[model samples]
Target chain A: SPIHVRAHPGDVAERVLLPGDPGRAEWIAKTFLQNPRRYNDHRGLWGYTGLYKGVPVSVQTTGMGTPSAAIVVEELVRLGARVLVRVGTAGAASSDLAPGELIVAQGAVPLDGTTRQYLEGRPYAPVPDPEVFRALWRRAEALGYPHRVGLVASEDAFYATTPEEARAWARYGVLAFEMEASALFLLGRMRGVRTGAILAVSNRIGDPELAPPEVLQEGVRRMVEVALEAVLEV
Target chain B: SPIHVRAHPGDVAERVLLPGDPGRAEWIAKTFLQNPRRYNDHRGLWGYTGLYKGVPVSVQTTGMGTPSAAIVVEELVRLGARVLVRVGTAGAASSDLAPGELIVAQGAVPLDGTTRQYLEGRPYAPVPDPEVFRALWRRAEALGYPHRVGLVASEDAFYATTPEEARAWARYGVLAFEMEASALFLLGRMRGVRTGAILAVSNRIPPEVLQEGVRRMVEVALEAVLEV
Candidate 1:
């Protein structure tokens, strides 16, 4: 048993959808899965397994931040999860990306601390599995969601991000800033597991705009559909 | 109250010595301070305020890693801390640095994730306050302690560092890797507080030589704090 998760070998599906909020995990399972069974609730990082379109799928919560998120990913991988897709919200770094749009991160600028421990300042790139990345982009296009495939920054600090930091990453053409994706991507590469992320733009810190809750929810729902499609295809 | 620390404005001293371990904070207070008083123990992050060489000082535990250290530094700055000096242990990156030696970090490579959040991917230099850095170096020299003054890498993950990571940092002249100094130095610059760090090498991926180096490192940091 992993330290944070209390699931056995067969409890979780090989393909898993990771949400940073446990509440979202619960909602995703209850709304999308058929007869979802809770597999683990240790440390309030809820994990549930159920059927999606007659295929077994699991949704697990990573809580917040890279440290907590990495723990969940490491544990899930240890328990035989093969494909992981993160469905989370992000703050827009680019002015072009508006709230309610989706971003399929092809790569992440590893501004995350957790990856630094693993990569050790080597300027290691956090690229997602090509197959997974393609699946997400293709599925998003098939589903007709307004989306972009580009680089996103996985930042460690939430409130600590200065305006200068936002502008600097935006200058590099980073589309959005989310906390956990770089670690997820890097860990995937290190462990040889398939991984990708589809983020809903919740706010544009540069333009100083926030998506209304309804808009954010709509984007999240679209993201889930796209992520699930990608998971099923891969 | 600031998020992690449970103390009022007056409970903390302006000049503080920060260690990563709570027990070390208690030891520094009990061993060095005159009339030391424990002021906060919230979340087992211990804190004490007392006098050192007739000057007021506080020794507080920053916990481990940048996330925990940044929280402590942020809260202390909010509570009126003006100067922050970290006394901690490090793993040597360079083959030249042996266990039981000391390192006075002139600056830190912002390899830490916490600083990136504040620096926003802009390359920010994490240098110590010139005066504080000078005091630490000169005091170490005066005390005849085996020490070096140079760049140190402050990392975020303790167990996650690979041998390649250590070698990569060593090639770039990082003397050692510790968990908190980069956050401390960067936050100090961003917040306009004076800061410096003195680290004792606990291991070189060699034998675990801690007690002698720790005692020597603690004495050197105390001497420098007094000199400052």
Candidate 2:
């Protein structure tokens, strides 16, 4: 048991969904899993275990930012999670991507601090496992949810992001700005596990209008189904 | 008027000392400053301004991590603080540095995420302003305190460091591990202000010897600020 996660061995499943909000974790377990049981809620980072189409799955909150997310992911890996998928929301960088679309990040630019420390500032790309990316992409395409696979920039600052930085990343074909995917992908490579991310668009950079609550919730539900399907495929 | 600091434009002085802990900021103000007056305490990040050797100085708490530290530094710069020195504690990486010693960081490895986000991980080195570093080093030597001036690693994950990582940094001549200096140095360079750090050795010799080192550090930092 890690310092943050208080759970017994075999309580969590081998495959898990990482959401940044604990409320979303609860929603995922209640909406998707059958006979779901809460196992851990220390630090308000809830974790649940249940069956998805008769296959065991867990959904856990990773919190905001890479530092907080890295702690949860490290502890979860120690607790027998081998495959992980991040189902979260993002702000679209490109004009082509609007609210309610999905972005399956193939790789992440190391805009985050955690991966650079682990790699010692070496120029390494934090790409997901090839098999995991393929499964996620195929599932999104098969399910016919409008999605794109490209590089995403993981930023540490939510309010401090300058408009110039966001425009620069958009020029480089980055789909959106989200917090935890780069850390997730980097730790997966470092620890020899499989990981990928599917981000639903909640807003765009130049646009003032955000996706409505219903739209956001619908996008999240779509992502949950695709994530579960991708897990089975993996 | 910034989000964290509730100080006015003239409330802060041009020269300021930054410590990570709020209690230490209070101690520095009460112990070193003459007639120090408290200015800000929003989020429990204390700030005070007073006179040291008849020169204006301020002591403020920057909180613990890089995200918090960067916010405070940015706000201070906006309020016209031109010279900033971070006084804090570090765990020694090299065997030469024991508890109660001091480290004046000349540069820092960008181990924290906040600086990388600002610079876009562009192979930048977070070195201190030359004038500030020289003054800090001269004061440490003049005070007869054992010290080293070199690279210090700034990490965000305090509880996640591996032993191999420490040994690797030691091989590359990193003197210690602290959380906020790299972000401070990088922001200084970006904003075109003077910045440096003086860290007292707290652990790496023994865990419980931290409080004594902090007292020693407060003394050294007080003298170093006056010297600068």
Candidate 3:
């Protein structure tokens, strides 16, 4: 009634995975969790809640960029969900981190125009919740997944991204280029909720050689499992 | 042709005095300059070009916030104008800066929401032109207007400014608070124009005290000529 993606407080689990793609949401629910239920189908964004190792959890597809993520996160918090871990796919920023790798974003560069409105022109650094970050790190090591953690950038328009923008960001030591994580992380801080992100590299950026489709899909499956394991063990 | 305050290039002078209040623009042009010619009178905003202290100058009224100031500055710059000095009024943020004192803004706090879309993210800082600041400082010194140079926040909403927001800003050491400088300065930078602002304190914020009426009119007139 208030906005899109309606749900009740008690209907959702306290811990949730905010994924950006809807098909990935369905795949996650079908493959990983035991007993899933669709929460809402508004705007074709499917939400599923289920349990893993007896701890209740949910996965909600958060459509696209910062403004959309902000809308979803705000409503989710209002519905009693806390501690979000965004699992998505991204492009690598550096040559060392090739495609089919994992990146745990520690902080984000605020290139997105949307988050600035919420923070009101103060310093626009989108840092992940440290408590949640440590949990992801510990879980990653225990699972033996190849991952790196550090700064990532939030960009506004996908097509308008220039090569100069990427090279400039790379000079500042950003580990990878992902669209939605920085917004999720920053909005969580502004709204008093804990947030972090895990991204699987779908393609190599600034590299001439491209990875095969099967390898990229394999990376996605690995990232999804790592994210769920991180949630389960953290 | 569509609306008010329309002026073609070469119709207005490169040097201009921009005040927020339209009535103040009239009062400044008539009372301060010699042989002032009314250039445009659309949108209740008065515009004039004349010689002030033997130097060519103009006066145009820009309405209240960044949205309004952005329109005036963009159109003025588009019309081949440069060297804009906003002789307007503002509220004090710090206790050290008192009422009736002058402030030449060095930079803006980047608080204007309208400006974000134009400048993008953190690469740019909204500060004033050094040459314009020098001219302003020299003139204010000559005119003997009590003045300070520092950061002033350009905000979107004037009425929505809360006491708690004021208190929060004071702790961060903002010298003054106003509504239009950042948009003007940023637009100036983008369009290759020189820009500066001279704010005469009209009110002490959190209390909303206005200057004595006679003194305010005199201050506005003095600011037009004295700020350069």
Candidate 1 runs further than 4 Å off:
A160-168, A206-209, B1-111, B116-155, B158-228
Error of 3 at A189 (Å): 1.6
Which ranges in model 3 have alpha carbons more than 4 Å from their true place? Answer: A206-211, B1-228
Q: Give per-model TM-scores.
A: 0.59, 0.62, 0.52
Worst 10 residues of 2 chain B by lDDT: B205-214
DockQ of each: 0.16, 0.14, 0.02
Candidate 3 backbone collisions, by pair:
none
Error of 2 at A26 (Å): 2.3
lDDT of 3 by residue, A110-207 (tens): 66777667656574335555456656766777778888765577777776665566665555456667677767865665566677788877765544
| Residue-level lDDT tens digits of model 1 in B65-173 | 6766787888899889988899988889866778888889999987778887777667888888888899999888888878888988887655577667787888888
Docking class of 3: incorrect
Estimate every model's Cα lDDT from 0 to 1: 0.84, 0.81, 0.71
What TM-score does the predicted chain A of each candidate obtain versus native chain A? 0.96, 0.96, 0.93
The full ranking of all candidates by lDDT, starting with the best, is 1, 2, 3
i-RMSD values for every candidate model = 6.6, 6.1, 10.5
Count of residue pairs whose backbone atoms collide, per candidate: 1, 0, 0
TM-score of 1: 0.59
Q: Which candidate is the best by lDDT?
A: 1
DockQ (0 to 1) for model 1 = 0.16
In the range A179-201, model 2's lDDT, one tens digit per residue, is 78888998898778999999899
